[PDB]
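Note on ligand handling. Small-molecule inputs were canonicalized before submission; formal charges were left as drawn, and no protonation-state enumeration was performed. Where a ligand contained multiple stereocentres, the stereochemistry in the source SMILES was retained. For S-adenosyl-L-homocysteine, this procedure yielded the string shown in the input block below.
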Amino acid sequence: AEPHYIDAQRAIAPVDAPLAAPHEYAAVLRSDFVSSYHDGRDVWTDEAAMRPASAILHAHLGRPAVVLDAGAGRGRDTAYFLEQGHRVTAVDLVEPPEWAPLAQRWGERVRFVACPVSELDGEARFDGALDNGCLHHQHPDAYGTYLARIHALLRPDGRFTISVFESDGPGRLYANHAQRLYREFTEPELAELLRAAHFTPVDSQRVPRPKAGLHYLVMTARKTD
Ligand SMILES: Nc1ncnc2c1ncn2[C@@H]1O[C@H](CSCC[C@H](N)C(=O)O)[C@@H](O)[C@H]1O
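Structure output:
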């Protein structure tokens, strides 16, 4: 494992020290994201390779439905889902200004919550859920609880689409300069993670990131019976 650029601006380096505890890490996570959005360093928002994941989830729903956007950022995917007729709940640690014009355009069809995914209450509220680059930044000890919340929030026939950084070789854990964690996955590794979280993968796509010279891995799953 060697340091490498993960996006236009950020080089990430393999973690070699003991990780910050999950409680401390939550603050590191919020701090980096709020600074990045404030500064306009959210280079993911306008990356063209980020657009296929939402269309993939819609294809697996096939109808207007109720969709959770977990880690929704500025709302690009939320707008995409609303344009298909979905009702959407968008959740993020950081509330950006762009949620207001979206609320104006879509009214009661969109709901926004500026909270961690883990704070979402309820069960069986959504037909679909999209994680477009959120899970792969969580503390590894929090993957299970994060995915279990998604799993519980989905209805029995729910679909979950997740996009992560694709690894070249066995996936490793890295950190950016602000100490945000980045996990890259192989397809077997991501499938194994989902199966352990009681999801059964039904599709997976390697989405090129041409300007970054990398790929996203976009996997869709149902609940395991
Ligand atoms: N535990 C958590 N709960 C809610 N949002 C989180 C989170 N951890 C990270 N995030 C948010 O996850 C997003 C990852 S960046 C991707 C943003 C958006 N999905 C897009 O497609 O552009 C950031 O907006 C970050 O603030």
